[PDB]
Design an enzyme around this catalytic site. Sequence first.
Site, PDB file in Angstrom:
ATOM      1  CG  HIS A  90      -0.397   0.208   2.487  1.00  0.00           C
ATOM      2  ND1 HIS A  90      -0.100  -0.843   3.322  1.00  0.00           N
ATOM      3  CD2 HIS A  90      -0.057   1.330   3.157  1.00  0.00           C
ATOM      4  CE1 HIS A  90       0.400  -0.375   4.452  1.00  0.00           C
ATOM      5  NE2 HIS A  90       0.446   0.939   4.375  1.00  0.00           N
ATOM      6  CD  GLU A 109      -1.135  -4.000   1.715  1.00  0.00           C
ATOM      7  OE1 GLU A 109      -1.951  -3.865   0.767  1.00  0.00           O
ATOM      8  OE2 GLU A 109      -0.264  -3.140   1.986  1.00  0.00           O
ATOM      9  CB  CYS A 146       4.052   0.953   5.760  1.00  0.00           C
ATOM     10  SG  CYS A 146       2.849   0.569   7.022  1.00  0.00           S
TER      11      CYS A 146
END
Length: 164
Positions: free
Chosen positions: A32, A56, A131
């Site tokens: 993402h 992911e 992330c």
Amino acid sequence: HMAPPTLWSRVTKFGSGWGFWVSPTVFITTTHVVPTGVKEFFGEPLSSIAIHQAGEFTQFRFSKKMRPDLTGMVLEEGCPEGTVCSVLIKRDSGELLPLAVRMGAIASMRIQGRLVHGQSGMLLGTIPGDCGAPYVHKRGNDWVVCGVHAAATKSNTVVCAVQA
Ligand SMILES: [Cl-]
Ligand SMILES: [Cl-]
């Protein structure tokens, strides 16, 4: 085990987060944070890159050596439960914030509607922007990367995406 400078040098600003050079041609990140609709990464056309994304976890394999200074390291699908990893968090300021995490179970999870094939762990905090940071541990001579940062509880529990 203390992560050396070359290991840190693999952690690369990318999209809305980070990614990690596993070798001169292989780059991993969290899906993402990846820029969508682009036609090149690191100046290489899509056509020249083998891309696999699931749960992911995103992996790029370039046709050309992109980080020819690096050796290739072992990429594994998560780690054994109980393993203490380091999450190699770089902040936009330049600060290095290695976080120690005791890993728990690998599972396919739904987090904020997104399917994450990942591994949870308990911190021994992460923020939006982090992330893609790699979860690593040292086994014998070798550093092993086993996930990329994907989520955390409000609390403290963290989750990395892991490769199929
Ligand atoms: Cl660095
Ligand atoms: Cl192990």
